[PDB]
C-alpha cells in the first residue's frame, strides 16, 4: 500500500539527451516545469548516445551516499543490482535549464541478451523482429532494460507509487512487458504521430478514408508491421494511452484501435523568447540588396509573408503557399493595388552555399551605404563649419565615388532578382524551386508578389541575411505553415509566441488545439479537413488578401493581440495536461486509494472526465 | 548574460545597503557551453578552413603535409590555410584583408619572381613589418634604403 | 538632423536609378540656429566663465586686466 500524494516519476524516451526528434524539444522545454514538482523524485531514461552524451551530460557518480536522498535510496540499490548483472549505463544532470536527473542505459552492454529477447517478445506479445532493423532491435533493447530497472525499483521501492511516461513507439517495448509482469508501476504513453500517418501521407488521401483502411494490410505494404504492432502493443498495454493533439487522436482512434483518455499538447518556455521595427530593418537591407538594379516598390508599403520549417514539401503545404501566392498576386494585379508581398521560404535544402549573383547585390549596396555615408558626413563637417564660421555642397570628388557606387548597381539587361540565394545542389529536380517555375513568379516588376527561397538555416553571422531565425521571424509581418501532416507544428506555435500573425491549418495540431479557443487574435485557419483541395488553396488566398489590406491601425490591433496569446503556450498553462494524465493513471492502478485520497470515485473514462 | 546577471545583483545589494553569485541556473548553460567545445579525442585544429575542391593534389596542404606542422600541442608554431579571400561578412575570420593585416604582427612575402610586389608594398603602407626577398622589385627598391 | 535628412534622399535617389538639396524647410532652420549665434556689437568672448564672488578684487582677473588680454 503505496502512497498516490507522493510519488516517482520515469519519463522515457528514445531521445532524452541526443536530439534525432522534435520530441527532444518537447521534454527538454517541458523540464523546467516538471522539475519543480518532482525535484528528485523525477528521472528520464533513455538510451545512451555515445557520440554525443559527453556535450549534454553532468557525469555523476551514483554510488556516493550523498548522490541520493534517504527515501530515494531504492532507485540507487535498483540500479546497482543492474550493473551486478552487467548492465552499463551514466546517471547525470541533463544540461538544459532544470537540469533534470538522467539515466542513460548502454545498449551494447546489454546487446547480449538480443535475441533471447526478442523471443520472450514474440512470446508474450506475438511481435515479430527481423534482424535487419537496427532502430527496433535497439527498441527492444531498451524496452527489456527498463522494464527491468522499473522491476527492480517496484521491487525495493515500497513508500512510493510509481508512475511511468513512455514517449513513442521506440520507447514503447517496455509497456506491454510491465502490463505482462504485473509490475507495480502505472503506466503512460504518449504518441507524436502514427507509422500508419506519416507514411500514408508520404505519396499524394488521407483524412477522409483514413477510417476504412485494413490497418494489417498497410502496415504490410510499407514493409512496417512489426513496427506498426509494437506502436499498437505500446498503445493498448498503458493505463493512459494520449497524444500530443486532437487532429492526432483521431488518426489514433483508427489506425491504433485505441481512444486517446487525452491530449497532451506541446508547451514551449515562453521566457526564452521575450523589436519589430528595428528587426524589419534588416529585412530590408538584405531586400534592397536583392533587388538591387531594379527596385521599382515602396519598402513603406511592403508586407514579408514566410513559411519555415523542415523542407516537407506535401505535409508543410510548401504547395499550397506557393500555389495560393500565385493566385495572390493575379487577384492583386487584377484589383490594380499598391502594395507588394515579399515571400520566404526558409527550408534547408542541399546546396553549395550563396550564389555568386547574390552576393554581389549584397555587397554593391553595402558600399553605396558606405559612401553616402562618407558623403554626407562630408556635407555636415562643411554646414556646420560654416555656421560656425559666421561671419553645390557636393565636391566633384564626391560626385565621382557617388556616380560609381549607383553605376554598380545597373544590372544586365532582362536578367531578373533570382528566386533563390544559394547554389541548389539538384537544381533539376527541387520540388520547391520546380513548383516556383510553374507558377512562373519569377520577380519581374509586374509580380505584386515577390519569391525568395532561402534553402539553409538562418544565421546572424550571414553575408546575405544577417538574421538568426528568432531575429527574422519578428522582422516579418505573417507566417503561412499551411501543413497537410503534421502532429503539432513547433514552427506555428513559436512564430505566434513571438507575437506574429501566422495563417496554419486544421489539419495541424497546433491548428486543431488553437481552433477551441475568431481569427481577430492573429490565427487565421484554413480547413484542409473538409474543403476539397482547391477549395482550400482558395480559403488560403482569401486570409492573404485579407491581410493585405489591413490599414496601419488594423495591423497593429492584430499583432498587439496575438502577443498576448502567448502566455497560453507556456508549459505552466499546458503542464497541467500532464497532471491529468499521471493522475488518471493513479485513479486506474489504484482505484480504492484514490477514492481516499478525493472523497469518492471520481469518473475514470477519460483525463477530462476526472477533472 | 551571466556576467550582467552578476553586475544587477553586486549592484543592487550595494544600492540597498544596509559565497557563490551564480545561480546553478547560470551554472547549468555555462557547463553547458563548455562542453560543446570538446572535441573529439585526437582530433587536431584543421590546417584548413575550407573544403578542398583538390584535397589530394593541392600544392600548399601537401607541401604542409609533407613537413607535418600538424598543429598538435607540442609544435610551438601553429598552421592556419584560408584559401580565399577576406571579407568582413565572413562566418570565419570577419575582416577585409585590410583590417586582417594591420591586426598581424609581421608578413611574410618570400617571392622569387615579382616584378614588383603590391602586397608587401601595401603591407607596409599600412604600417606592418615584412619579409620581402632582393629577387622582388619593392624588395631590390627597399634595399636602397 | 539636417545632413541626415541629406542622406536619405541621396540614398534613395542612388538605390532607385532609373541643385539645392536642402529643402526651403532646413534652411529656414540652419539660418535661425546661425543667427543665435550673434553676439550684441562690440561684446567680446569674456575672459572668465564663473560669477566671481569678489569680482573686483581677485588677483588673477585683476592681473589680466592690467595686461589688458
Ligand atoms: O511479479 C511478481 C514478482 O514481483 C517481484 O519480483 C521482482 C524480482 O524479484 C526481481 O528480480 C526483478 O525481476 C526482473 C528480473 O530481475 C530481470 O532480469 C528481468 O527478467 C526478465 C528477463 O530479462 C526476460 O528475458 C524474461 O526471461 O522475463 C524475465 C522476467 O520474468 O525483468 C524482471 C522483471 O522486472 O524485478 C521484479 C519486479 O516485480 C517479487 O519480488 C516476486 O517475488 C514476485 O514473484
Ligand atoms: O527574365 C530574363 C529571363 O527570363 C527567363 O528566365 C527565368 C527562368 O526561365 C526561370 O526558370 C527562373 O530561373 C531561375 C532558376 O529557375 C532558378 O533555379 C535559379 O537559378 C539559380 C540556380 O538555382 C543556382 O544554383 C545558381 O546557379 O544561381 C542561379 C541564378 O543565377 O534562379 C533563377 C532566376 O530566378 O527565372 C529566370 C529569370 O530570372 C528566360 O528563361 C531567360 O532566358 C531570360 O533571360
Aim: aromatic letters at 10%.
Amino acid at each position: 500500500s503505496r502512497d498516490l500524494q507522493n510519488h516517482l516519476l520515469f519519463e522515457t524516451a528514445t531521445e532524452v539527451a541526443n536530439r534525432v526528434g522534435g520530441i527532444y524539444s518537447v521534454l527538454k522545454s517541458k523540464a523546467p516545469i516538471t522539475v519543480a514538482q518532482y525535484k528528485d523524485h523525477y528521472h528520464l531514461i533513455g538510451p545512451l548516445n555515445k557520440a554525443t552524451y559527453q556535450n549534454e551530460v553532468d557525469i555523476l557518480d551514483w554510488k556516493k551516499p550523498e548522490a541520493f536522498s534517504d527515501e530515494m535510496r531504492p532507485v540507487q540499490h535498483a540500479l546497482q543490482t543492474m550493473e551486478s548483472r552487467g548492465v552499463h549505463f551514466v546517471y547525470g544532470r541533463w544540461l538544459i535549464e532544470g537540469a533534470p536527473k538522467v539515466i542513460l542505459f548502454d545498449l551494447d552492454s546489454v546487446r547480449g541478451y538480443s535475441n533471447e529477447w526478442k523471443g520472450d517478445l514474440w512470446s508474450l506479445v506475438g511481435i515479430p523482429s527481423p534482424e535487419n532493423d537496427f532502430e527496433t532491435n535497439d527498441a527492444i533493447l531498451l524496452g527489456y532494460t527498463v522494464a527491468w530497472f522499473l522491476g527492480e525499483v517496484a521491487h525495493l521501492d515500497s513508500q512510493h507509487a510509481i508512475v511511468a511516461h513512455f514517449h513513442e513507439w521506440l520507447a514503447g517495448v517496455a509497456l506491454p512487458l510491465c502490463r505482462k509482469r504485473r509490475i507495480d508501476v502505472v503506466t503512460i504513453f504518449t504518441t507524436h504521430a502514427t507509422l500508419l500517418g506519416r507514411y500514408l501521407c508520404a505519396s499524394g488521401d488521407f483524412y477522409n478514408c483514413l477510417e476504412s483502411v485494413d490497418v494489417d494490410h498497410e502496415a504490410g505494404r510499407f514493409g512496417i508491421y512489426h513496427r506498426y504492432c509494437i506502436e499498437r502493443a505500446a498503445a493498448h498495454s498503458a493505463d493512459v494511452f494520449t497524444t500530443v493533439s486532437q487532429i492526432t487522436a483521431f488518426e489514433a482512434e483508427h489506425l491504433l484501435k485505441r481512444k486517446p483518455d487525452g491530449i497532451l499538447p506541446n508547451g514551449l518556455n515562453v521566457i526564452k523568447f521575450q523589436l519589430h521595427a528595428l528587426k524589419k530593418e534588416k529585412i530590408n537591407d538584405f531586400v534592397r540588396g536583392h533587388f538591387h538594379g531594379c527596385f521599382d516598390f515602396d519598402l513603406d508599403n511592403t508586407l514579408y509573408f514566410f513559411i519555415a520549417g523542415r523542407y516537407e514539401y506535401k505535409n508543410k503545404g510548401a504547395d499550397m503557399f506557393i500555389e495560393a501566392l500565385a493566385r495572390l498576386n493575379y487577384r492583386l494585379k487584377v484589383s490594380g493595388s499598391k502594395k507588394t508581398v515579399v515571400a520566404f521560404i526558409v527550408m534547408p535544402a542541399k546546396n553549395n552555399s550563396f550564389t555568386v549573383e547574390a552576393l554581389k547585390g549584397q555587397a554593391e549596396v553595402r558600399a553605396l551605404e558606405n559612401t553616402v555615408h562618407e558623403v554626407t558626413t562630408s556635407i555636415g563637417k562643411r554646414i556646420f563649419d560654416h555656421a560656425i564660421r559666421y561671419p553645390e555642397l557636393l565636391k566633384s570628388s564626391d560626385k565621382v565615388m557617388l556616380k560609381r557606387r549607383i553605376l554598380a548597381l545597373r544590372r544586365p539587361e532582362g536578367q531578373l532578382p533570382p528566386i533563390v540565394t544559394h547554389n541548389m545542389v539538384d537544381d533539376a529536380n527541387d520540388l520547391i524551386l520546380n513548383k516556383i517555375r510553374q507558377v512562373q513568379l519569377f520577380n519581374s516588376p509586374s509580380d505584386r508578389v515577390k519569391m525568395i527561397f532561402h534553402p539553409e538555416f538562418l544565421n546572424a553571422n550571414n553575408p546575405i541575411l544577417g538574421l538568426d531565425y528568432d531575429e527574422f521571424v519578428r522582422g516579418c509581418h505573417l507566417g503561412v505553415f499551411p501543413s497537410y501532416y503534421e502532429p503539432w507544428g513547433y514552427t506555428p506555435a513559436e512564430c505566434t509566441v513571438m507575437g506574429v500573425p501566422s495563417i496554419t491549418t486544421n489539419v495541424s495540431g497546433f491548428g486543431s488545439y488553437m481552433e477551441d479557443l475568431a481569427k481577430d487574435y492573429g490565427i487565421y485557419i484554413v480547413d484542409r479537413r473538409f474543403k476539397a483541395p482547391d477549395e482550400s488553396v482558395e480559403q488560403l488566398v482569401d486570409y492573404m488578401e485579407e491581410f493585405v489590406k489591413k490599414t496601419a491601425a488594423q495591423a497593429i490591433n492584430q499583432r498587439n493581440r496575438t502577443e498576448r496569446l502567448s502566455d497560453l503556450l507556456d508549459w505552466k498553462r499546458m503542464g497541467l495536461e500532464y497532471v491529468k494524465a499521471r493522475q488518471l493513471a493513479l485513479r486506474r492502478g489504484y482505484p480504492d486509494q484514490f477514492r481516499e485520497l478525493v472523497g469518492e470515485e471520481l469518473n475514470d473514462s477519460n483525463m477530462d472526465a476526472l477533472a | 548574460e551571466v556576467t550582467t546577471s552578476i553586475g544587477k545583483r553586486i549592484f543592487d545589494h550595494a544600492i540597498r545597503y544596509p559565497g557563490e553569485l551564480l545561480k546553478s541556473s547560470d551554472k547549468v548553460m555555462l557547463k553547458r557551453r563548455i562542453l560543446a567545445l570538446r572535441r573529439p579525442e585526437g582530433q587536431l585544429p584543421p590546417i584548413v578552413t575550407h573544403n578542398m575542391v583538390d584535397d589530394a593534389n593541392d600544392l600548399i596542404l601537401n607541401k604542409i603535409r609533407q613537413v607535418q606542422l600538424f598543429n598538435s600541442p607540442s609544435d610551438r608554431v601553429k598552421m592556419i590555410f584560408h584559401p580565399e579571400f577576406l571579407n568582413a561578412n565572413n562566418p570565419i575570420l570577419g575582416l577585409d584583408y585590410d583590417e586582417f593585416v594591420r591586426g598581424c604582427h609581421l608578413g611574410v612575402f618570400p617571392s622569387y619572381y615579382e616584378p614588383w610586389g603590391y602586397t608587401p608594398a601595401e603591407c607596409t603602407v599600412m604600417g606592418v613589418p615584412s619579409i620581402t626577398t632582393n629577387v622582388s622589385g619593392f624588395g631590390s627598391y627597399m634595399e636602397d634604403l
